Amino acid sequence: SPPTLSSLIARTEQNIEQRLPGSWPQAREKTLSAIAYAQAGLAAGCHEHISWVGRQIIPSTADEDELLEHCRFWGVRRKQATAASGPLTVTTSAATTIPAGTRWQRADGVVYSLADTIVIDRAGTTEITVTALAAGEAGNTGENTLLTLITPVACVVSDAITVKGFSGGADIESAAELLSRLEYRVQYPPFGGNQFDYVRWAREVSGVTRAWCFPTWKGGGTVGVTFVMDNRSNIFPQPADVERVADYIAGHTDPITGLIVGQPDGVNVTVFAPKAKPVNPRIYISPKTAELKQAITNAINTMFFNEVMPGGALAPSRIIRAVAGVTGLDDFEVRFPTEIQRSENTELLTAGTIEW
Amino acid sequence: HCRFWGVRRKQATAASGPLTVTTSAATTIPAGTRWQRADGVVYSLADTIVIDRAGTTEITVTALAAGEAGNTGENTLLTLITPVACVVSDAITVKGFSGGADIESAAELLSRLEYRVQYPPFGGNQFDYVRWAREVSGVTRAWC
Amino acid sequence: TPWQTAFLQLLPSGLAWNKSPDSKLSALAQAISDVIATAADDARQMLRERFPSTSRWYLGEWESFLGLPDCTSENGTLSERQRAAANKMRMTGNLSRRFYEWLAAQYGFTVRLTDSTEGQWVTQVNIYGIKNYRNATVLDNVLTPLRVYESGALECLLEKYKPAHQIYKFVYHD
Amino acid sequence: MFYIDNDSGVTVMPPVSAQRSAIVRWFSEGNVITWPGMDWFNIVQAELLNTLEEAGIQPDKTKLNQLALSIKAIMSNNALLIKNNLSEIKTAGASAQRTARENLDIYD
Amino acid sequence: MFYIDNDSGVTVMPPVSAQRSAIVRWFSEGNVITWPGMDWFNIVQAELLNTLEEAGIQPDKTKLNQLALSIKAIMSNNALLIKNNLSEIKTAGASAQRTARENLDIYD
Amino acid sequence: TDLAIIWTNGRGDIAQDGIDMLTDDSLTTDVTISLFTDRRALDSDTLPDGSDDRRGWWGDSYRDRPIGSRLWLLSREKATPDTLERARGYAEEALEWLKTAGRVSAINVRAEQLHQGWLYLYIALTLPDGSVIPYEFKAAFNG
Secondary structure, three states: OOOOHHHHHHHHHHHHHHHOOOOOOOOOOOHHHHHHHHHHHHHHHHHHHHHHHOOOOOOOOOOHHHHHHHHHHHOOOOOOOOOOEEEOOEEEOOOEEEOOOOEEEEOOOOEEEEOOOEEEOOOOEEOOEEEEOOOOHHHOOOOOEEEOOOOOOOOEEEEEEEOOOOEOOOOOOOHHHHHHHHHHHHHOOOOOOOHHHHHHHHHHOOOOOEEEEEOOOOOOOEOEEEEEOOOOOOOOOOHHHHHHHHHHHHOEEOOOOOOEEOOOOOOEOOOEOOEEEEEOOOEOOOOOOHHHHHHHHHHHHHHHHHHOOOOOOEOHHHHHHHHHOOOOOOOOOEOOOOOOEOOOOOEEEEEOOOOO | OHHHHOOOOOOOEEEEEEEEEEEOOOOEEOOOOEEEOOOOOEEEOOOOEEOOOOOEEEEEEEEOOOOOOOOOOOOOOEEEOOOOOOEOOOEOOOOOOEEEEOOOOHHHHHHHHHHHHHOOOOOOOHHHHHHHHHOOOOOOOOOO | OHHHHHHHHHOOOOOOOOOOOOOHHHHHHHHHHHHHHHHHHHHHHHHHHOOOOOOOOOHHHHHHHHOOOOOOOOOOOHHHHHHHHHHHOOOOOOOOHHHHHHHHHHOOOOEEEEOOOOOOOOOEEEEOOOOOEEEOOOOOOOOOOOEEEOOOHHHHHHHHOOOOOOOOEEEEOO | OOOOOOOOOEOOOOOOOOOOOOOOOOOOOOOOOOOOHHHHHHHHHHHHHHHHHHHOOOOOOOOOOHHHHHHHHHHHHHOOOOOOOOHHHHHHOHHHHHHHHHHOOOOO | OOOOOOOOOOOOOOOOOOOOOOOOOEOOOOOOOOOOHHHHHHHHHHHHHHHHHHOOOOOOOOOOOHHHHHHHHHHHHHOOOOOOOOHHHHOOOHHHHHHHHHHOOOOO | OEEOEEEEOOEEEEOEEOOEEOEEOOHHHHHHHHHOOEOOOOOOOOOOOOOOOOOOOOOOOOOOOOOOEOHHHHOOOOOOHHHHHHHHHHHHHHHHHHHHOOOOOOEEEEEEEEOOOEEEEEEEEOOOOOOOOOOOOOOEOOO
């Protein structure tokens, strides 16, 4: 919190008056006043530089390059971008050789380049595998798309339609994602056997959105893990997902040191999947419209995603807050959830269909 | 032109602010007490205030100089001119004085005259009654 | 002051100028250079703010970034807030009883993890030298009492950072 | 200087509260916990600053013996000094010397 | 004794930061509550200890009148006394008497 | 209207007056600055000291012109006409920047030896018709 320019003016004037007794530098159109103003301006510039030197001590408020340096020091590693690829099914008209390095551009502008030379000896379609040069999320396309030809070949039709689209296009993690990962790492320290350790282990595996760990689940020697994948439509684990998460917790190499880390040898983890326990509210809306249907549904879904945990009890007020968060409607009285709903650790609360 | 039309120029305005003064034994400040600045501009309090106990009190004081010069800043020290019993000649002004507007400029006066010329008549309407009720100082909400 | 000496040295050198320590040039140089002196003091204290163990301006930010405010951070003592931040920032360790004793003692307490009494997993946290009084330092507020009495800071800390499989059993000694 | 130079302070002092106890009170760590408050600190700081002002020395931060210099300055401004050898009477005027001789019983 | 003997003080006094505000600043509990800091405590105890050392009195925790004794010692060292009858100015030397009398206009 | 330089005890300094410092809006300050601040000596000059340091100002490479006068080379001289001639030349060179502009019309400087041990310089300018009345003071001693 640097001092303001007027405060700096006042401070310089007080210093001048203290050092030269009997003087009043605040007088208008005077040498001491001009000197005080100039010194105040210089001090304001200096204090602004000090403030910029600050504010980069912590990774949260740091600038871009300093944030990247902080993450690199703390050990957060980025994920590099990929490139899309797939078949082309290009049609020729005679025997010809498509030289290696030819390019097929799509309407958008993305350019896909052939890797190895191909020799054709018939007047018919031939399938070749091409990879994108963009190397980003824009690489992958739909199912039957058209690609033109940047420069003509000896006897090849310019257009080329891909029956099965390209796939494998990803983006490098952004600074916001890196900062979030570093913040999570700092907030929840690694111990090797803690509840946060089990949660982060179950979250590091690809595709998993949320996880929970119950210590001393079924006695003094065992624990419990329960994960929920929110990207997928089901949003509940499968046996294959459960066994692969158990494998990952049992053993996985650490990218930093190259050694494998995991659970202790004396504990019983037994990761399992939750069981849905839906609740069906009955909310009355004054204006009945599809926009309010969507808004209330999305608010309730988010409310659950935020403040619902397996084994926990949700008060009826939560639904009321979620439905009141909407703007257009006038009345939002709920009728079904008038009592507190609770469940066991195996049971996971979920928002069932709403009966308007 | 302004004299003919009916627009009057706005003269220079004083500057008012808080005076933090402490008394010794709870005296009554007269109606016209005066304080002085180092440069030699006079400030006056036109009111009467009785102090209950020995402590610092804030009083609204307006300058006696019409121009912008009578406009101090932060933490400016002021002293009394005529001694008052159980009052120490000290004034701090934690908040600086505000005000100090000089005479109106030619462009501002021209804009005011053009406003007077171009503004329309406002016959009694449900919207206009709201403004007329709300223009009075203190009134904050109106309904017609 | 060294800053006024620097200003006087920056001013021109000649017969017309008087740089003796009693002249008006010196008396004005002190006032001119004191502002930059305060600025340099602020820029120097940023070096102390660099760490959460000694930071005073950025305690709020160091707590928000770390998610600090929790059981192990005491009621209002700025020294204890600094200690909690400085321990949470560099707390990584194993599950052994030796490490748990070291971690508990790093906060000022004294415990020993002795063997069970009824089972195998239920280790006994024998807490010695219990003292709930924390002396008000010079950093904290002017309105704080001389002693702040806080209890149960170690209990929830150890229950939060305990191994997932194990369950502790606390016993207080004197 | 001797006052609090931190960013936390008010340029106008808060008035002291009224008297509550007619008996001298003290501090105690243990049996009621005591807190300093603004009044005690303000009183001590104001006593030191007013002693300095009476001596005429303006407060400065680098120096620490200003209280001793204040006591010595009051001593010189009010009492005679061994090193001065009764120079203040003369400095005052001629009637002062006349009255000093009168008190020492030195007639013409 | 007088200083911090609570096993919480450093042997070497930390340096005092430069002056920030020129005007006097007082304590206040209510718009940001102020804290004393190390500089205020160090300055106050340094002034008291400097007065004690100027008087030539070594600090001792048992006694609680050493400031009054210090002021009295400064008096007995640097001032004339009523019980001495000017003896201090005449045990110094003959030149002191000569200067005193020529000042008091008592010469040949 | 900058600060004025007032000479006391043979050493000039800024001075106060009422509320703030004394101000000057004439050639007096300009002349008393251009005459009595040491400028950088040339490479080939022999310094009066036994040292090897030449004076000047850190702003000489920022102000488009050397600041003052080379009168400091005559710190220790004997009573010979060579020193008088050199002092005349140095004063002319130091104050010719005014004649280069239009602030003065002519400069007439003479050097002499008054009562034994006095290096007397008489510098008379010719201000133009529009120049303001210059300041007026005398060197003073105290204590």
